[PDB]
Amino acid sequence: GMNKAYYIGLMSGTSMDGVDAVLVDFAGEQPQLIGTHTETIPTHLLKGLQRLCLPGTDEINRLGRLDRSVGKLFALAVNNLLAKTKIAKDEIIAIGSHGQTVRHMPNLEVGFTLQIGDPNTIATETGIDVIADFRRKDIALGGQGAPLVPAFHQQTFAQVGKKRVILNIGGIANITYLPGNSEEVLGFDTGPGNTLIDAWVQQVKNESYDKNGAWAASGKTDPQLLAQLLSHPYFSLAYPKSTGRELFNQAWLEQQLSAFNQLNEEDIQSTLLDLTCHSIAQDILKLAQEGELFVCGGGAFNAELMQRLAALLPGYRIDTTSALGVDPKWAEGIAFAWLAMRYQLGLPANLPAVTGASREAILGGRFSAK
Template identity: 75%
Template sequence: MKTTTGLYIGLMSGTSMDGVDAALVQFSEGQPTLLACHTENYPEHLYKGLQRLCQPGSDEINRLGRLDRVVGKIFAKAVNALLAKADVDAKDIVAIGSHGQTVRHMPNLEVGFTLQIGDPNTIAIETGIDVIADFRRKDIALGGQGAPLVPAFHQQIFAKPGVNRMIMNIGGIGNVTWLPATGNEVLGYDTGPGNTLVDAWIQQVKQEPFDLNGEWAASGIASVPLLTQLLSHPYFLQPAPKSTGRELFNQAWLEQQLSEFSQLNEEDIQSTLLDLTCHSIATELTKLSNNGEVYVCGGGALNGELMKRLQALLPHHHIDTTSALGIDPKWVEGIAFAWLAMRHVAGLPANLPAVTGASREAVLGARFPAQ
């Protein structure tokens, strides 16, 4: 087994499909320090191409193959920009951990699968650094959901004996990690929509990429009947382990739900969609514990209106962002994929069967050498 020290890069692109976050991380015996970070935004044509690829359509294999390479090149561009910013040589990096860009996540089919693109061979060649990628499919092969994978990282970095803690990542989809005070089994699963629907609605109506600080949602009044209908989605009643994505919570589903609510103001719909995120999260957190510490990361941590509503729904919980624990909420997942690469290089397991439903722990990912 190799050492768990050295420099790694984590690459993360989530459900929002707006770009890739690159994090340069120094590990000292498994503990991370973020040294530098960079975000490479997707060009508009790539964003639209990925959106189309997420819906069944014609010529899918050709489009998939082309976008696999294009996303790989963007990921490599992010790495090279990060190295230039940090003034670090590629030869000093042990490996890149690349999440890839999810275009399908269907773990509950008779033969379940998950698919991430962003060709790791292309990343390795264009950066000169070995790439560890394809982290999710080993867990799927072992009967798991392939997601979420970050709870194992959360456990190592954020758990505190004697304190009930929940790490709530709110990206496009929300996922929670339960770190019990007793040190008993860690749990984690996707709670449902995070930012994906509120982003989709403001993009459709106002052509803005996201609702800055939740200001548009704050200007509206949530519709209780619409919220009740949205919360009736069967996913919210499923027991864990469970995971979800754009396959369930997408613009087509949203339009279907809104068909009976055409009388609502646009800002009231936005407010209701934010309530859907907050209510679905609060319900799951309350199931785990009726008190304790909640630390939010991901883009949702930067949405003041979301954080305010979450605290109102969870008056007995202490709610903060992971900044209070020493890690910028925007970079938790990027650091996590650097950690997953480090675990692979060290020959250490990185999944939690209680979280994903896999039959056993496993070393995740495959190595794609630059040479």
């Protein structure tokens, strides 16, 4: 557009909430969010994606097929975003697509990360160039491949004179530390965000999530369970660190609970919420005892989580990223649009102090719509 610099960002989280699609203008000083869209993952594709953890079921062939399917769903998400915003595909510079994570294993001897959602398919079915596959360059340089939001967070949320934490509560929670001086930006996965509280409410209540943490609020934390969960070696690891689904998952949880079979389900729920809150708070208080905390992702909307976090961080002012003018629901999609913009402009996006990569590098691959 006319002094517009339109990018699309596409993110499909590990929690299966859908493909989030954002149309962002980066021509100005702050990102301007133009339009948003969530594309529902159809249940046949949801089941396929779940099967990728079922051994002896032709998982590689299934991966290749679903990579195509996810690509088609990401393109549909783009096209539905264009139908609601009514901006021509030709006005879009590039799509920044995270894809959908299937494996994240940065700490194997030979480290790797695996996102599907074929960027050739997205480019073909949208008519817009695609920048995708952002994590693998960071891994190639010895990094965790994650989090990648911190450089975006520094540019968008940092305030000279203020120590800020940006906390994204997805399946896994990650913090960005923005010290508010010459000092380096930090960031890492603290541990579980919503992944375990979601798994437990799905198991017991067959709801997809615990709305506003109200079920957690009805229960009482078991201190023995909490202490045991918090003793996982992951929480004692130094940053840079990230984790996917290999540590905090249903199988792990079920084995953790195999002495607490007679606990009330709502007490387990409360305890799992506290695992998230306490692991996050502990990490934040190691960076600074006082500051400003800005929350984004699904957990920003959980009022029980937010007040528990408030009680744990009395020296913090606590808000969602809304206070900094960025919708908590859309923050992560915007970051991926920003990642495409960085590529477009030939600029690096990872940070060595964040991921452990040996240097800042240009992230992603470009797939032509032509």
